[PDB]
Design a protein around this ligand. Structure first.
Ligand SMILES: [Cl-]
Length: 130
């Protein structure tokens, strides 16, 4: 229905705002663009599902997210990809892991404070009805 389309449009507006807030934070600059195969030629071989905030904006605009749970699965991938690719005790890897965990925790904290649970439940029920 047009009412269900309005629901998904509100979801996209909400997810674009959350993603913009993460992308303008200087801590998360490394997560704003895909990894350059020049700097890192082994990345695309180790990480099977690369994800970054530019890709997340593209997915929002392609109507790939019908629930906040589907969005958070891609935020979780940004975090888990960084924990897997950068697992060493050296400060460079520790700094990327801390920044990836902070991204993920920030996204969840914004959603906990600003997403109505009844709005999420409505999205989940339209998605399940298709
Ligand atoms: Cl830095």
């Amino acid at each position: 229905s047009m009412q269900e389309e309005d629901t998904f449009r509100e979801l996209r507006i909400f997810l674009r705002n959350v993603t913009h807030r993460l992308a303008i934070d200087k801590r998360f600059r490394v997560f704003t663009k895909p990894v350059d195969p020049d700097e890192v030629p082994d990345y695309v071989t180790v990480i099977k599902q690369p994800m970054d905030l530019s890709s997340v904006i593209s997915k929002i605009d392609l109507h790939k997210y019908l629930t906040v749970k589907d969005y958070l699965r891609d935020i979780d991938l940004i975090c888990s990809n960084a924990l897997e690719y950068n697992p060493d005790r050296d400060p460079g890897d520790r700094l990327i892991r801390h920044r990836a965990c902070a991204l993920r925790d920030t996204a969840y904290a914004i959603i906990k404070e600003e997403l109505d649970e009844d709005f999420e439940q409505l999205c989940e029920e339209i998605q399940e009805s298709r």
